[PDB]
Amino acid sequence: QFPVEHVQLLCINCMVAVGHGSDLRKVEGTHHVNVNPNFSNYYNVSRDPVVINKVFKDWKPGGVISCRNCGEVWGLQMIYKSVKLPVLKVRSMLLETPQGRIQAKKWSRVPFSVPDFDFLQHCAENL
Amino acid sequence: RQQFPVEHVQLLCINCMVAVGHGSDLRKVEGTHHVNVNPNFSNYYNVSRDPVVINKVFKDWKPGGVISCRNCGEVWGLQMIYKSVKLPVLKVRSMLLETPQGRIQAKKWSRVPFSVPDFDFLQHCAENLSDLSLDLEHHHHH
């Protein structure tokens, strides 16, 4: 396990640095989203939204998110209680750590702790 | 419900929608993995030279590179090196099925409107073993 400040995020395909492990938060203790507003500069969002045959209480899908540099698909946009959040697939984010680059197979098993998303907190850091 | 002849189902990349294959070229490995056995199918996809990692050893096969549309780069699945033979393994959701009744995107191979037969290694080998007598300039050719 590494302190989260020592873990950076890179696109698994083109390997450009696109984020920081410290910007990740969990939604419903499962989905991992990046809450840093500067992260938006590293991905594109598809015109049409992802179609899901189910209705969720607090969120609805937005478009597909992909690396702005190479087009690699990273996951999708989650519109949580009206707030847009990029949900990342763990395999899409190559981890840059003190022991080298690591490709994790499950968010629940990455070598660092991630805090649960807190809406109130998110509003503080962004208003 | 209705089941279509496999020759009447074409495969298109769910993304760019280019016609890449035919339903008749699919076979099931272990009754689950769906591979395309048409050698000419190779021309429609790319393979990353960095094999997929799986922390499990399989008796008859090992993972190969990640496969994707040679046209748009959409990921289709992974290469399977079965008893030394490379077979492209396709996830159903990455394929768009063009049937006699419009295009259809299934979400599970176990529910497509056609029957995919089992892969047979010996058959595959025979079909692909070089018969030099077939070449006009070979001394065995009649």
Next chain:
RNA sequence: GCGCGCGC
């Protein structure tokens, strides 16, 4: 789409 389990 994203997650978890199991299998391969």
Next chain:
RNA sequence: GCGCGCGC
């Protein structure tokens, strides 16, 4: 990275 199941 595929399959099956469930969850979101």
